[PDB]
Write an enzyme that holds these catalytic residues in place. Structure first.
Site, mmCIF file in Angstrom:
data_model
loop_
_atom_site.group_PDB
_atom_site.id
_atom_site.type_symbol
_atom_site.label_atom_id
_atom_site.label_comp_id
_atom_site.label_asym_id
_atom_site.label_seq_id
_atom_site.Cartn_x
_atom_site.Cartn_y
_atom_site.Cartn_z
ATOM 1 N N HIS A 185 0.808 -1.221 0.000
ATOM 2 C CA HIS A 185 0.000 0.000 0.000
ATOM 3 C C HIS A 185 0.847 1.280 0.000
ATOM 4 O O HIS A 185 0.267 2.368 -0.120
ATOM 5 C CB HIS A 185 -1.017 -0.004 1.160
ATOM 6 N N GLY A 204 3.514 5.586 10.504
ATOM 7 C CA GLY A 204 4.835 5.391 9.962
ATOM 8 C C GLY A 204 5.478 4.075 10.325
ATOM 9 O O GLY A 204 6.568 3.778 9.823
ATOM 10 N N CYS A 221 4.378 1.109 9.530
ATOM 11 C CA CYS A 221 4.161 0.037 8.563
ATOM 12 C C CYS A 221 5.488 -0.453 7.986
ATOM 13 O O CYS A 221 6.414 0.334 7.750
ATOM 14 C CB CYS A 221 3.209 0.482 7.446
HETATM 15 C C1 LIG Z 1 1.199 2.469 8.562
HETATM 16 N N1 LIG Z 1 2.228 3.242 8.648
HETATM 17 C C2 LIG Z 1 -0.207 2.779 9.114
HETATM 18 N N2 LIG Z 1 -1.247 2.003 8.415
HETATM 19 C C3 LIG Z 1 -1.907 2.414 7.324
HETATM 20 O O1 LIG Z 1 -1.713 3.503 6.774
HETATM 21 C C4 LIG Z 1 -2.969 1.426 6.823
HETATM 22 C C5 LIG Z 1 -3.145 1.483 5.304
HETATM 23 C C6 LIG Z 1 -4.484 2.140 5.031
HETATM 24 C C7 LIG Z 1 -5.129 2.445 6.366
HETATM 25 N N3 LIG Z 1 -4.275 1.801 7.397
HETATM 26 C C8 LIG Z 1 -4.620 1.583 8.715
HETATM 27 O O2 LIG Z 1 -3.791 1.056 9.451
HETATM 28 C C9 LIG Z 1 -5.958 1.952 9.396
HETATM 29 N N4 LIG Z 1 -7.036 1.785 8.429
HETATM 30 C C10 LIG Z 1 -8.031 0.901 8.232
HETATM 31 O O3 LIG Z 1 -8.783 1.037 7.286
HETATM 32 C C11 LIG Z 1 -8.329 -0.297 9.156
HETATM 33 F F1 LIG Z 1 -9.242 -1.079 8.576
HETATM 34 F F2 LIG Z 1 -8.835 0.056 10.337
HETATM 35 F F3 LIG Z 1 -7.272 -1.049 9.425
HETATM 36 C C12 LIG Z 1 -5.958 3.363 10.075
HETATM 37 C C13 LIG Z 1 -5.474 3.274 11.531
HETATM 38 C C14 LIG Z 1 -5.032 4.373 9.378
HETATM 39 C C15 LIG Z 1 -7.378 3.943 10.073
HETATM 40 C C16 LIG Z 1 -4.225 0.728 4.542
HETATM 41 C C17 LIG Z 1 -4.932 -0.418 5.244
HETATM 42 C C18 LIG Z 1 -4.087 0.437 3.056
HETATM 43 C C19 LIG Z 1 -0.378 2.582 10.631
HETATM 44 C C20 LIG Z 1 0.211 1.460 11.205
HETATM 45 N N5 LIG Z 1 0.128 1.161 12.512
HETATM 46 C C21 LIG Z 1 -0.536 1.952 13.322
HETATM 47 C C22 LIG Z 1 -1.204 3.129 12.887
HETATM 48 C C23 LIG Z 1 -1.932 3.980 13.760
HETATM 49 F F4 LIG Z 1 -2.003 3.658 15.089
HETATM 50 C C24 LIG Z 1 -2.571 5.105 13.333
HETATM 51 C C25 LIG Z 1 -2.508 5.438 11.964
HETATM 52 C C26 LIG Z 1 -1.814 4.656 11.071
HETATM 53 C C27 LIG Z 1 -1.134 3.466 11.493
#
Ligand SMILES: *C(=N)[C@@H](NC(=O)[C@@H]1[C@@H]2[C@H](CN1C(=O)[C@H](NC(=O)C(F)(F)F)C(C)(C)C)C2(C)C)c1cncc2c(F)cccc12
Ligand SMILES: *C(=N)[C@@H](NC(=O)[C@@H]1[C@@H]2[C@H](CN1C(=O)[C@H](NC(=O)C(F)(F)F)C(C)(C)C)C2(C)C)c1cncc2c(F)cccc12
Lengths: 306, 306
Positions: free
Chosen positions: B41, B143, B145
């Site tokens: 992604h 960040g 991921c």
């Molecule tokens: C990575 N750095 C980050 N994750 C994403 O950006 C990831 C990516 C979109 C939305 N993502 C999410 O993790 C969720 N979104 C969702 O739709 C769901 F279903 F709930 F998982 C959000 C937290 C951003 C709403 C796609 C799935 C393609 C990431 C990683 N780890 C923790 C995070 C947070 F705590 C907060 C925000 C991003 C986070």
């Protein structure tokens, strides 16, 4: 989000661990530049442990009585000296993996990462606090002596702890890296014991702020309290006093959540007087006191190390 | 003695982390030999997240659309391809720090260490379990991921997890290193949610054995139980069933303590039916299920990694 007991990356410390052997005693040493640091009781026999004169024992040793293994490669010892309760073994090779470092001594209530080690080979990493009674609740078996505790700030390793001994309650005692014991403990066999501990109040409050940041709010209330009224309750439950400096240190967390520090104190007071009623906070049914305000800001904001 | 939630030394993994940028999205990648692995992604815009056709999005990218930073040094991307939910970025330099490694997929109930990372810079290390519902209770901010989960066996790193996404309950979902999600989760914005979890019974029993090894015995009793009677109680409390293979795996611990596995099950049954009555086990007022029998033997015996 989430909240875990998180240690610093250990790689910079892994590259410093070595194995020190003297007679039939093997333990861990810390290799920085051309000096290996290790607990001085490596030079003791079983009967020496009883009432040792370390100056006497050391003058009878030679450089060749010390075997140092860095991986599968022997380091030649070219000098030795004693500094308080640590030995300094002068080796003929500077450790090319030496990171930028400092020797710092920590306060009870502060936290650090431990790299547990056996035969100079790192085994695991975990996060500890220095208890108010100057012990640490570690995880150490035979051969772990000389494993070190540390923190990392940007790229610099601040060493604060070297493991020496397990006390009868299963807790651990050691020194700073200048060889000065944390607390009233000595490196000889006595009936020494930990002595009474307390709970680190400012850390509990930081952790309650971490919980709010992470979505646990059930313990919040509208009430507030004065600092003194709070400290009267804290003393009753064997918590240490909260100072105005603790309140100031909690300011950033108070601002991010919008919960005044003294309001959080009211919540802690209620938790101490009523328990948790079967609920949990950040996956714990106990009030956790081994995260500092700094640890909470780090993990609920995202600071790294290079 | 002592018992801590202990992670593997992270140094071998630290030397593999890099920063991957595509457009205005930066995340972490894993650099092994001349390939950088990262979540696919990274190539998505905000509106792309909604319902992406990843094959379409990728064919429109070029090698030069991918910026890879290894420390303060840029790596040139010379090829790219998609394998399930991960990107494979072909770089012109093999990572000289590449450890011996394997890509393995773990079972729910198994544990691993996570090296949390931001901008390709490691931030902390901690121990996780794969929950029965294929989520992990991690600690991750924006960040993170592309941070990876791993185990170490002697000198070999078995990578098992790459972080992709946070679910609405604050738990985390990701893939193995072949890009196949753990559990029924997808890398696009849906209303996806974790779904019901259970407690990992065999791990709780291992931890009770760790407690006995460490001197907590108050929960022991003379009673015993049959496996089926035990599993009838476990189902009632949302614990997973205990198998004869679980009983066999617990044999070594049973032998070291002299407590038959089924006797421990009687103790667990009593704890589930009566709670802890204000007492604690290994410093916890909850039954801990994120240590495997292997983890307990490791830490209560002293196995290292080279
Ligand atoms: C990575 N750095 C980050 N994750 C994403 O950006 C990831 C990516 C979109 C939305 N993502 C999410 O993790 C969720 N979104 C969702 O739709 C769901 F279903 F709930 F998982 C959000 C937290 C951003 C709403 C796609 C799935 C393609 C990431 C990683 N780890 C923790 C995070 C947070 F705590 C907060 C925000 C991003 C986070
Ligand atoms: C280091 N590898 C080991 N510690 C010692 O060998 C250390 C050293 C003797 C005795 N030591 C002890 O740690 C205590 N002894 C004590 O007298 C006391 F007071 F309780 F601390 C023992 C556990 C061995 C009884 C001297 C103090 C000079 C070590 C380190 N960490 C954990 C250990 C164990 F869990 C068990 C055994 C040795 C341990």
């Amino acid at each position: 989000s989430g909240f875990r007991k998180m240690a610093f990356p250990s790689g910079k410390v892994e590259g410093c661990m070595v194995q020190v052997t003297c007679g039939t005693t093997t333990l861990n040493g810390l290799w920085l530049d051309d000096v290996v640091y290790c607990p001085r009781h490596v030079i003791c026999t079983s009967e020496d442990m009883l009432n040792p004169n370390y100056e006497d024992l050391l003058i009878r040793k030679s450089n060749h009585n010390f075997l140092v293994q860095a991986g599968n490669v022997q380091l030649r010892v070219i000098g030795h000296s004693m500094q308080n309760c640590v030995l300094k073994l002068k080796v003929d090779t500077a450790n090319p993996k030496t990171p930028k470092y400092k020797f710092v001594r920590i306060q009870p209530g502060q936290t650090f990462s431990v790299l547990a080690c056996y035969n100079g080979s790192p085994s695991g990493v975990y996060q500890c606090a220095m208890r108010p009674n100057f012990t640490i609740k570690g995880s150490f078996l035979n051969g772990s002596c000389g494993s070190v505790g540390f923190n990392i700030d940007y790229d610099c390793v601040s060493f604060c702890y070297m493991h020496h001994m397990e006390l009868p309650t299963g807790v651990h005692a050691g020194t700073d890296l200048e060889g000065n014991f944390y607390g009233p403990f000595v490196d000889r066999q006595t009936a020494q014991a930990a002595g009474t501990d307390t709970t680190i109040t400012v850390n509990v409050l930081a952790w309650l702020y971490a919980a709010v940041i992470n979505g646990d709010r059930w313990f919040l209330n509208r009430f507030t309290t004065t600092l003194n009224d709070f400290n009267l309750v804290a003393m009753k439950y064997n918590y240490e006093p909260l100072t105005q400096d603790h309140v100031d240190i909690l300011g950033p967390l108070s601002a991010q959540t919008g919960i005044a520090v003294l309001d959080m104190c009211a919540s802690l007071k209620e938790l101490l007087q009523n328990g948790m009623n079967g609920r949990t906070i950040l996956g714990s049914a106990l009030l956790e006191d081994e995260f500092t305000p700094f640890d909470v800001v780090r993990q609920c904001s995202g600071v790294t190390f290079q």
